[PDB]
Short mmCIF file of C-alpha atoms in Angstrom, two decimals:
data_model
loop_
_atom_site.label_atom_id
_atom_site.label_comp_id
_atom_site.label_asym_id
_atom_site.label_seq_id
_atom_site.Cartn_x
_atom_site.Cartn_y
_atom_site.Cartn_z
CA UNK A 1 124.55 95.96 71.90
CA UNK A 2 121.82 93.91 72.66
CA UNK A 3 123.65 90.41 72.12
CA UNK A 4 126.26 91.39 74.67
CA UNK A 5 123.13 91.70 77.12
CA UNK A 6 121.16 88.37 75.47
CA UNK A 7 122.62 85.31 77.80
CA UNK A 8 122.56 83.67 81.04
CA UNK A 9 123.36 85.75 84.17
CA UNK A 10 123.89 84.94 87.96
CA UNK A 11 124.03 87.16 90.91
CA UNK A 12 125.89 87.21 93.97
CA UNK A 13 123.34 85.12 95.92
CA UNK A 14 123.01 82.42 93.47
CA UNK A 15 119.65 83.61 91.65
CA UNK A 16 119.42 83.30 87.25
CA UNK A 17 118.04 85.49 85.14
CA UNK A 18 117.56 84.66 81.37
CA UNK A 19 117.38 87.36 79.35
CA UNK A 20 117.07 88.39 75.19
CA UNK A 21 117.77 92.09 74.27
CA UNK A 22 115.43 92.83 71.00
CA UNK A 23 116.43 95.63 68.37
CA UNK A 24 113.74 98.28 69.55
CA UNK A 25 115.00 98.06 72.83
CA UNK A 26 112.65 95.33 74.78
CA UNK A 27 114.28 92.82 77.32
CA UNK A 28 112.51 89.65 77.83
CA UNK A 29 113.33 86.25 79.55
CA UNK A 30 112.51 84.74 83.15
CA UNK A 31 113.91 85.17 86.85
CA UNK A 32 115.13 82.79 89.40
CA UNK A 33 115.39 83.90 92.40
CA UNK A 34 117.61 82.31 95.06
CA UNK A 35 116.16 83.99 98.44
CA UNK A 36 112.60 84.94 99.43
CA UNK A 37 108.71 83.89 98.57
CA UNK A 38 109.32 82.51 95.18
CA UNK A 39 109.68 79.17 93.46
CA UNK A 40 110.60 78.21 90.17
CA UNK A 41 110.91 80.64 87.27
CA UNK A 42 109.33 83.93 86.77
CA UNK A 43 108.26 86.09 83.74
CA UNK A 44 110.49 89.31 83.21
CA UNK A 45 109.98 92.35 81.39
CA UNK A 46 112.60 95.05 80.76
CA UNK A 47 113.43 97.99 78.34
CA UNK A 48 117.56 98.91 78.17
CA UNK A 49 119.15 102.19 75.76
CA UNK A 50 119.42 100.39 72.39
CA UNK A 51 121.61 102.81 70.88
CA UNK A 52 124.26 103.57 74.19
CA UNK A 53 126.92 106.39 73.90
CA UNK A 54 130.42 105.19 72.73
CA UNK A 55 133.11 106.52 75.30
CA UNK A 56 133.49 103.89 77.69
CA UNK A 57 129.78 104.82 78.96
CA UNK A 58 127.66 101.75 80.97
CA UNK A 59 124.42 100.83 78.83
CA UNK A 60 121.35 101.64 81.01
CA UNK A 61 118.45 98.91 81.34
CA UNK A 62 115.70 98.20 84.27
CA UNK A 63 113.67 95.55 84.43
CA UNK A 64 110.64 94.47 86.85
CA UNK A 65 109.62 90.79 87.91
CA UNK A 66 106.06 90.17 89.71
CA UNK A 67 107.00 87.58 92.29
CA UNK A 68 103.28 85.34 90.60
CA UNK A 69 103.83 82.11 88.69
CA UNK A 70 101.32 79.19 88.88
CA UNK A 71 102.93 77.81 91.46
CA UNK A 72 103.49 80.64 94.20
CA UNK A 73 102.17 84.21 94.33
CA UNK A 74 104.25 86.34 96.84
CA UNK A 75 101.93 89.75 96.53
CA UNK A 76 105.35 92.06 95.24
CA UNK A 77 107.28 92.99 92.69
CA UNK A 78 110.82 94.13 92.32
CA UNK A 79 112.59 96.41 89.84
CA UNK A 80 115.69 96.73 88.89
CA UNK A 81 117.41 99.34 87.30
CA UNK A 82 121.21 99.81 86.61
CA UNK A 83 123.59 99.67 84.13
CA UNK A 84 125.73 96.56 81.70
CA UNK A 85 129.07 97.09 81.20
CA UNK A 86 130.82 95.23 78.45
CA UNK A 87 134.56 93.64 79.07
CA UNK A 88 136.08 90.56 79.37
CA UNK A 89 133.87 90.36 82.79
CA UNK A 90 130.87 91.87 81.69
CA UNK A 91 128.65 92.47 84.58
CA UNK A 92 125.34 94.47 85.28
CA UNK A 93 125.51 96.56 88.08
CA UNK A 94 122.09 97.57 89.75
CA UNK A 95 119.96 99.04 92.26
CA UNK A 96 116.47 97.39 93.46
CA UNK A 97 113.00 98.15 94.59
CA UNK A 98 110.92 95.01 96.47
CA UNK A 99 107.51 96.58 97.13
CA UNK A 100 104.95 94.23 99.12
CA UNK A 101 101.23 94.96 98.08
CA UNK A 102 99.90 96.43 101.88
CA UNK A 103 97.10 97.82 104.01
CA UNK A 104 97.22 101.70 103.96
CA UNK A 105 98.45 101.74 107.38
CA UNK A 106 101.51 99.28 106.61
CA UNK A 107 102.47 101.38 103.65
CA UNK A 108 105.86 102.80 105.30
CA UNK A 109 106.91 99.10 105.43
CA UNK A 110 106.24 98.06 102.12
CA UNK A 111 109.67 98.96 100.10
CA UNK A 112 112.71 96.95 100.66
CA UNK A 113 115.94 98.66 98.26
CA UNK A 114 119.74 96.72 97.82
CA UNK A 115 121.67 95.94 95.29
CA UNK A 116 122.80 93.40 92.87
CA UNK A 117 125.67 92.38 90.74
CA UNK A 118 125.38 89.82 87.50
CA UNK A 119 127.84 88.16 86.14
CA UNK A 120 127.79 86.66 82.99
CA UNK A 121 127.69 83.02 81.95
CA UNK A 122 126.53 81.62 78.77
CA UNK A 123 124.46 83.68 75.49
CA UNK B 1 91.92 96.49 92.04
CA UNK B 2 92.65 94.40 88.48
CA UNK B 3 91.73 95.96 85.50
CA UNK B 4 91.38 99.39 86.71
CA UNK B 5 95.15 99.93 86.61
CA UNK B 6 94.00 100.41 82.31
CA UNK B 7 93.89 104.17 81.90
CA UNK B 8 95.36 107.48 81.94
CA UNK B 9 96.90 108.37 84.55
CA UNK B 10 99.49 111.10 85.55
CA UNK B 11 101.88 111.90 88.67
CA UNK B 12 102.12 115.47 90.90
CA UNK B 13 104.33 117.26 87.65
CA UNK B 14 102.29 116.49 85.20
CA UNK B 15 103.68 113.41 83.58
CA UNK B 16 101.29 111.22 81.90
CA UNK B 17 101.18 107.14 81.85
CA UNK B 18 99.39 105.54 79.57
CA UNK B 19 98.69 101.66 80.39
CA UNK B 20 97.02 98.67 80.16
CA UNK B 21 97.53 95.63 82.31
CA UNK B 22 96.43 92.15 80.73
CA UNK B 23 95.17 89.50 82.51
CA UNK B 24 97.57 87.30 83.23
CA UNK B 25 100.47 90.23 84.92
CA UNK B 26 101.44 91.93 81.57
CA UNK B 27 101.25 96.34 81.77
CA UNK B 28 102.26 97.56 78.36
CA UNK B 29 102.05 101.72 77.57
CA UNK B 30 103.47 104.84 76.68
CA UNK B 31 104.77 107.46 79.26
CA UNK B 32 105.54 111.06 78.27
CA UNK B 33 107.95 112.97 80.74
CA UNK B 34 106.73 116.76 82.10
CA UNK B 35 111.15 116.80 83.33
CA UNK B 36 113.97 116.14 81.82
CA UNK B 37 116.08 115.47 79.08
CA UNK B 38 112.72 113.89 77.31
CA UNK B 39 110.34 114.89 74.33
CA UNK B 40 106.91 113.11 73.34
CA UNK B 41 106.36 109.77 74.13
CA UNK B 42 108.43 106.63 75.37
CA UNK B 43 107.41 103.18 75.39
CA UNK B 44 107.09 101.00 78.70
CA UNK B 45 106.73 97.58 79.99
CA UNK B 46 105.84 96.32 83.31
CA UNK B 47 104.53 93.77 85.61
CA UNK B 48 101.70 93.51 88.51
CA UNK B 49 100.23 91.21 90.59
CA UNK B 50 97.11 89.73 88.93
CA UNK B 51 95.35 87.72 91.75
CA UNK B 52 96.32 90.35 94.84
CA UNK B 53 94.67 89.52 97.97
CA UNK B 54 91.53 90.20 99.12
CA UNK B 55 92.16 91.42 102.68
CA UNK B 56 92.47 95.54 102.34
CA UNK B 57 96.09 95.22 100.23
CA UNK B 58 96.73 97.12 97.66
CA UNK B 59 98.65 95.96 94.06
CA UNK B 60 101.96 95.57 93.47
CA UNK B 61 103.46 96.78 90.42
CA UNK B 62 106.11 97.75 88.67
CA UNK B 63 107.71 99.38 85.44
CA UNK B 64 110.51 100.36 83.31
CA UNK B 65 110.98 103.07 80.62
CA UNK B 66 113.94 103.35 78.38
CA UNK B 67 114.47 107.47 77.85
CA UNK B 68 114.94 106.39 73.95
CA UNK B 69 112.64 107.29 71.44
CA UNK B 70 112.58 108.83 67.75
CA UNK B 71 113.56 112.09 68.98
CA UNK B 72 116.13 111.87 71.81
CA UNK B 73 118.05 109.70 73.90
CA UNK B 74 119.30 110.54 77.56
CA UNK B 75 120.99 106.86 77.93
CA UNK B 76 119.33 106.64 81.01
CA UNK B 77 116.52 104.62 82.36
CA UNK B 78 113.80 104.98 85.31
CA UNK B 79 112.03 101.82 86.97
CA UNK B 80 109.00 102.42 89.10
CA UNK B 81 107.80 99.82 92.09
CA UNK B 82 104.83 100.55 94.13
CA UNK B 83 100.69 99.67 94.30
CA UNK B 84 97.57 100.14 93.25
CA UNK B 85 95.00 101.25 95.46
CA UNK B 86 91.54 101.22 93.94
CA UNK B 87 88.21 102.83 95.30
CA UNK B 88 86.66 106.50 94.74
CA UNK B 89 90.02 107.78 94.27
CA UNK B 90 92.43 105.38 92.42
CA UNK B 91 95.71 106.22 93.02
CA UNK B 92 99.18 104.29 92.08
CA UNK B 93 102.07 104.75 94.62
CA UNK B 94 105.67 104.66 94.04
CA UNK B 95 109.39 105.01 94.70
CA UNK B 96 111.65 105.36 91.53
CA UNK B 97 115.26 104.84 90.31
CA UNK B 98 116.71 106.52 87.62
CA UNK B 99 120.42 105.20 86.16
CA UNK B 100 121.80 107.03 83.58
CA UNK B 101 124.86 105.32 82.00
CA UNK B 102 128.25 106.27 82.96
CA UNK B 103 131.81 105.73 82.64
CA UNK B 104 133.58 103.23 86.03
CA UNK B 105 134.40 106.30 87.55
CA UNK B 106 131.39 108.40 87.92
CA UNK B 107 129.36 105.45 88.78
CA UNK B 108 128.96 106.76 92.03
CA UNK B 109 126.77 109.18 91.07
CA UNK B 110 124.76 107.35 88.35
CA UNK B 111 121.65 106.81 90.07
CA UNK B 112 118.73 109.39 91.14
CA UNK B 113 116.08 107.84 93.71
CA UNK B 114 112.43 109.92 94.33
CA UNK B 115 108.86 109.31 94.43
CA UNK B 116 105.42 109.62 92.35
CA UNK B 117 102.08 109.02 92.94
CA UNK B 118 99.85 109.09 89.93
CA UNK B 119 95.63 109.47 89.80
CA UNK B 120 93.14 110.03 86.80
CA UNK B 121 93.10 113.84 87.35
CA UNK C 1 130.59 96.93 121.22
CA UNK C 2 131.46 100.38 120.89
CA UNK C 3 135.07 100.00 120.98
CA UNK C 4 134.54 97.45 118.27
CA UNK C 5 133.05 100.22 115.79
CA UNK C 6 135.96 102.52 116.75
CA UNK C 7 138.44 103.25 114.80
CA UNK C 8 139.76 104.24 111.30
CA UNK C 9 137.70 102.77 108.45
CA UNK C 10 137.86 102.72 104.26
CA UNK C 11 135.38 102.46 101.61
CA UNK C 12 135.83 100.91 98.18
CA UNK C 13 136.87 104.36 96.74
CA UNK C 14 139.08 104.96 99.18
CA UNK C 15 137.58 107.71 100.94
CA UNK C 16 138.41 107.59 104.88
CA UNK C 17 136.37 107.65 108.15
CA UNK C 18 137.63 108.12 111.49
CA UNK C 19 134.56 107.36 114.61
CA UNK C 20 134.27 107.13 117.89
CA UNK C 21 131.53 105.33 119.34
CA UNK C 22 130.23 106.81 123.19
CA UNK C 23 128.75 104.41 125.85
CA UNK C 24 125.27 106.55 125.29
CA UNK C 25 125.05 105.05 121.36
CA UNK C 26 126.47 108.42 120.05
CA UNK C 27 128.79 108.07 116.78
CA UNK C 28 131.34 111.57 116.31
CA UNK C 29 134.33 111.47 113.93
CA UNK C 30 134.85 113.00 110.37
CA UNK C 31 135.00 111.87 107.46
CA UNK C 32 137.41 112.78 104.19
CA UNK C 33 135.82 111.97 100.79
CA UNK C 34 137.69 110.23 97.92
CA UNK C 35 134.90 111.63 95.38
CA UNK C 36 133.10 114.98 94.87
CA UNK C 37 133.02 118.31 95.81
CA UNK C 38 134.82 118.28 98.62
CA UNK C 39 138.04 118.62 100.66
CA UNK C 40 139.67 117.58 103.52
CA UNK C 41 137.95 116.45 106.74
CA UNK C 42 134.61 117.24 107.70
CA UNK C 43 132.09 116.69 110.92
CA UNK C 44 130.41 113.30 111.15
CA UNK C 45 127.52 112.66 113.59
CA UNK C 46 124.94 109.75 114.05
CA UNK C 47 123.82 107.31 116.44
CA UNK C 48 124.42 103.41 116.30
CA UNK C 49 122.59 100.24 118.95
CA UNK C 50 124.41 100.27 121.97
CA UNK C 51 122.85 96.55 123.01
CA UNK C 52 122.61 94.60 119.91
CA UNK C 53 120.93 91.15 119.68
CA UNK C 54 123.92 88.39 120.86
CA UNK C 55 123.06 85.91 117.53
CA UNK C 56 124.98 86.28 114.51
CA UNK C 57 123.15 89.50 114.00
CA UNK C 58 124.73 92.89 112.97
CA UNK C 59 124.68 96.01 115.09
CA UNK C 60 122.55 98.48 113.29
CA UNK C 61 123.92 102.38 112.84
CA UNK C 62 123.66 105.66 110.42
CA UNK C 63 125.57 109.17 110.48
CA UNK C 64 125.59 111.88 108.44
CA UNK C 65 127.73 114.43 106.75
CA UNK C 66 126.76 117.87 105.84
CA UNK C 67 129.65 118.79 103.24
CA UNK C 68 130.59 122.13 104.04
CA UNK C 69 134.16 122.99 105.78
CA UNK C 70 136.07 125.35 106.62
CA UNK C 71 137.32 124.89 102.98
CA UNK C 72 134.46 124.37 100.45
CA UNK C 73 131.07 124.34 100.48
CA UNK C 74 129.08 121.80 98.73
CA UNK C 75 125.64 122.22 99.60
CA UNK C 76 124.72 118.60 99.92
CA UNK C 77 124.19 116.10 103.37
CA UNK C 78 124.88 112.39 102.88
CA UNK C 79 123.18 109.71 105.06
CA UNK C 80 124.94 106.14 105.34
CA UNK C 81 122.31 103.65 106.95
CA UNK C 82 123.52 100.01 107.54
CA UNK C 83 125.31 97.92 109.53
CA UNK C 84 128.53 97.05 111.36
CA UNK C 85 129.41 93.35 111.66
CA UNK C 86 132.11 91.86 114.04
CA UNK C 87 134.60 89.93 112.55
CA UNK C 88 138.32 88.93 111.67
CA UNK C 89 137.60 90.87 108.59
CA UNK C 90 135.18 93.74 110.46
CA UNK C 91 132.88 95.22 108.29
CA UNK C 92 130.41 97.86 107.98
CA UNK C 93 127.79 97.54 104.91
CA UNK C 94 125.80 100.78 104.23
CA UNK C 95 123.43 102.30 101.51
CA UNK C 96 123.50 106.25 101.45
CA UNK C 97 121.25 109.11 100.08
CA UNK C 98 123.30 112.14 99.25
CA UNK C 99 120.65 115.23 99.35
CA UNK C 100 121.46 118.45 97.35
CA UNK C 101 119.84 121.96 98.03
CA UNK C 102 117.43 122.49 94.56
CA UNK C 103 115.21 125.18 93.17
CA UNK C 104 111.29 123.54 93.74
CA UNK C 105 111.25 123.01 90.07
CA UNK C 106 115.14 120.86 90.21
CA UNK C 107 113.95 118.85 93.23
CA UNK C 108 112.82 115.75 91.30
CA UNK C 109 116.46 115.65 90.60
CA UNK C 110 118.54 116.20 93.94
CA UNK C 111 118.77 112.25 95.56
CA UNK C 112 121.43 110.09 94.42
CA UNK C 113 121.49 106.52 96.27
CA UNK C 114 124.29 103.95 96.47
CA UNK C 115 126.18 101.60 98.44
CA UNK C 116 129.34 101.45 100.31
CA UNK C 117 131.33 98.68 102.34
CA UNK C 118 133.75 100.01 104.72
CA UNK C 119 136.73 98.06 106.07
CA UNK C 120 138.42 98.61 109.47
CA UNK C 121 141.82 99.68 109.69
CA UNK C 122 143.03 101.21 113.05
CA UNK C 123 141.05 101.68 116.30
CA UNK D 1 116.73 129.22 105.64
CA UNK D 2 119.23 128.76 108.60
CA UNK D 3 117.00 129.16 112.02
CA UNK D 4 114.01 128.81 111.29
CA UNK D 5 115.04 124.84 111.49
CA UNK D 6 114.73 124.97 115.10
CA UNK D 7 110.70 123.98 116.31
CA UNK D 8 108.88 121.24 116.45
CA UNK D 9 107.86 119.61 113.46
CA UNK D 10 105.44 116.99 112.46
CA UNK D 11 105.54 114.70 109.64
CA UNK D 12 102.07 112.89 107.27
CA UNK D 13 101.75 110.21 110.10
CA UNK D 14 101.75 111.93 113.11
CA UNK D 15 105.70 111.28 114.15
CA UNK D 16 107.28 114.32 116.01
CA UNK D 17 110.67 115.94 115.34
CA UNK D 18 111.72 118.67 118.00
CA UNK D 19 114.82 120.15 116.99
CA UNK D 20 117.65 122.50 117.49
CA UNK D 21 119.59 124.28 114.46
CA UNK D 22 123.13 125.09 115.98
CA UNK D 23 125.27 128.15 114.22
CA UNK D 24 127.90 125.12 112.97
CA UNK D 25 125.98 123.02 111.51
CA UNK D 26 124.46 120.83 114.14
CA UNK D 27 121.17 119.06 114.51
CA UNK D 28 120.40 117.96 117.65
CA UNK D 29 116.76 116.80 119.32
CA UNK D 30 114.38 113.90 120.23
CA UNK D 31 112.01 112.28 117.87
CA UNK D 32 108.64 109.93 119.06
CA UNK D 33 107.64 108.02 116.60
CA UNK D 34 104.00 107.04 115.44
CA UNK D 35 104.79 103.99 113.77
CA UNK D 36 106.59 100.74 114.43
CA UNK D 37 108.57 99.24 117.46
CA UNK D 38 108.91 102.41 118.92
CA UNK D 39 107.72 103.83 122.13
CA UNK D 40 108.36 107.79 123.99
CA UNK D 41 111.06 109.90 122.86
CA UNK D 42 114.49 108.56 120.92
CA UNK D 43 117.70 111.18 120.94
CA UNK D 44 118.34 112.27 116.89
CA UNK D 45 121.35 113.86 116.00
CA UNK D 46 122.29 115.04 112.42
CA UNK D 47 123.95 117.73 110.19
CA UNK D 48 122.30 120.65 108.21
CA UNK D 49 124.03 122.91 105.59
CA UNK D 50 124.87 126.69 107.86
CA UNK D 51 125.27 129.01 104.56
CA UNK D 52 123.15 127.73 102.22
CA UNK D 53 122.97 129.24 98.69
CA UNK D 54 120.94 132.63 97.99
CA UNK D 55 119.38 131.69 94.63
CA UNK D 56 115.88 129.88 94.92
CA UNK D 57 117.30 126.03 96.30
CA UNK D 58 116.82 124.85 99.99
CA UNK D 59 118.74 123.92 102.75
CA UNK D 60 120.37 120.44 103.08
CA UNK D 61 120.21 118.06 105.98
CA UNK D 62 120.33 114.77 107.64
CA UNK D 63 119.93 112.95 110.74
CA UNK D 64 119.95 109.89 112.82
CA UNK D 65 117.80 108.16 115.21
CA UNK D 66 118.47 104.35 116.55
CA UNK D 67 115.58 102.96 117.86
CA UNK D 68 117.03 102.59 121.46
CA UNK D 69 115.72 103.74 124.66
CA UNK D 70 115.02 103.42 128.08
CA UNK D 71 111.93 101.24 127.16
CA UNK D 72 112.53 99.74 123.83
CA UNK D 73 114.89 98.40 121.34
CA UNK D 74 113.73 97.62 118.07
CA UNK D 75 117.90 96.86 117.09
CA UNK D 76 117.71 98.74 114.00
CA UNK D 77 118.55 103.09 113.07
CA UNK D 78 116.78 105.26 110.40
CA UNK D 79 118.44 107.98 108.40
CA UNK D 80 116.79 111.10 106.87
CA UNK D 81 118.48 113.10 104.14
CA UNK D 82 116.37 116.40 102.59
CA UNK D 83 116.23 119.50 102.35
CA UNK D 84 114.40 122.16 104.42
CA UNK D 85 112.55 125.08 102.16
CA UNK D 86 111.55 128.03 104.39
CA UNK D 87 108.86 130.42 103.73
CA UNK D 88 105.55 131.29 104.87
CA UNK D 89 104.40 127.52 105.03
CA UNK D 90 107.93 125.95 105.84
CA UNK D 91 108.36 122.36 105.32
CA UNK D 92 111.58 119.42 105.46
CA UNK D 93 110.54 117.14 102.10
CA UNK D 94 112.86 113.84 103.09
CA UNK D 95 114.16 110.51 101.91
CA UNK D 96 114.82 107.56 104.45
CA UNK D 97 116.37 104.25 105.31
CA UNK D 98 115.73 102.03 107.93
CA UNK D 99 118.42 99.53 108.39
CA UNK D 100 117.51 96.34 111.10
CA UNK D 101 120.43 94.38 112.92
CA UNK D 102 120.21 90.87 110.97
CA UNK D 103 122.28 87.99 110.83
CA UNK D 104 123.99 87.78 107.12
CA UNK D 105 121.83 85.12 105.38
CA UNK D 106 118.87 87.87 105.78
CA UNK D 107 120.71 91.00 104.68
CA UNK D 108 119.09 91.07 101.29
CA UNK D 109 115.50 91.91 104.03
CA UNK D 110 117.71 94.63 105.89
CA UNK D 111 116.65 97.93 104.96
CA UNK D 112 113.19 99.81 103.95
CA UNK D 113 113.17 102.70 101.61
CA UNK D 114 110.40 105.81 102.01
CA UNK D 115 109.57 109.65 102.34
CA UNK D 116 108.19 111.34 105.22
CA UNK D 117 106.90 115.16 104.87
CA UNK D 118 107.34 117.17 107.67
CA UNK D 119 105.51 120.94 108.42
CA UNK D 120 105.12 122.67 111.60
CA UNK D 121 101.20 121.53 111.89
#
């Protein structure tokens, strides 16, 4: 359902992410991150399974941010791709990508991966 | 560099991406799946760095692609983070993560990780 | 600290590992898998920093498992990567790749990735 | 399949992996690296599948190497995981993880993701 993923989210280290699921399947909204090169908000872009299995089956979504506002550019993007799981503590589990634009020679160095949990606040 | 991210491009099994990156970060396209539970085409969205720098870096980039369309669904989803590297050969590097959805407990095994490096041949 | 590391350690699932760690850096033990195709104990190897940094820093380490016993064979190698950190509450925090023997054509498909925390029981 | 493990491999960036297959399952050897904090040999030790399947797939492995030695110590360990696929141009197609020692408020920065290709040239 995309209300259930429309709201305000927060993630173990303290970073937001805004977010509004739209009927064809599009996620939109803006990042905060707590740690790294960044400052200030952040334009996201996602896509998530609009019309998710019944059973008791995650929803599966990714989205990417481009760590570039106007007020800090940190060369990198990050995706994130996982799955929202509706409850009474609705969460989104995921997996991440950080990948630094390099030099061809510093290309083995240029992926970070972890992982992140959201927790939901408000709609 | 920039704009020459717009284009077709397609990875070593044949895939093919279809994008085009606006000016200020926006990459908006269709991606059509040579493996998998897939059929025709599937809409993405993405991000990339639109001022990189101007010492020999390449682009970062990224995107995500919902395996929805009018014809199937695999309720499972693949993002893509890598660069751009422009010149005689453009080429787009990457690493991948595909999460299917699953029940609590088989989410141990609910996420595939490879790579895929795409060029306009 | 090697003798730190040793010992008798669970993961979230509750799968078990049992390690050793030798003066040299070496890491032997098995380890018995809460999830899978698998059963009963099987060989562990890997390799960990015998001189960390002094700090508040972790000691880095990885093993793997090939799963195939004496019992069952799976086909399929696992690789934890992380690291141990010293503690009233000991912990090691790993990501893993679990590798599966494909066809060429099925090899796009034989990497999963995850995360697991492991906390120390018994030495 | 099985032996043919053993040998001295090479991956895209020059690295070297000399290894021995044991009967059991063991992967034992030294590995120099061509990139990084690194510097001479570093001990490896891993696992491999011994009776892999007969249909088309390869054979399963991983292994270990901490970036400790007599010279250096870059505090940090990468592990491969991949399969080897045997034939007349035999190659190990891998997956890794580098994980570096850090203190916890930099543990999101801890660990690299990548694929190294390794052939006997």
């Amino acid at each position: 359902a995309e209300a259930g993923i429309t709201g305000t989210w927060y993630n173990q280290l303290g970073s937001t992410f805004i977010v509004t699921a739209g009927a064809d399947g599009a996620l939109t909204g803006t990042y905060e991150s707590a740690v790294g090169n960044a400052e200030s908000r952040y334009v996201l872009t996602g896509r998530y399974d609009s019309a998710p299995a019944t059973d008791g089956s995650g929803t599966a979504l990714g989205w990417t941010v481009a760590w570039k506002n106007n007020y800090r550019n940190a060369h990198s993007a990050t995706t994130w791709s996982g799955q929202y799981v509706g409850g009474a503590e609705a969460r989104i589990n995921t997996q991440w990508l950080l990948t630094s634009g390099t030099t061809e020679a510093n290309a083995w160095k240029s992926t970070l991966v972890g992982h992140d949990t959201f927790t939901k606040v408000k709609p």
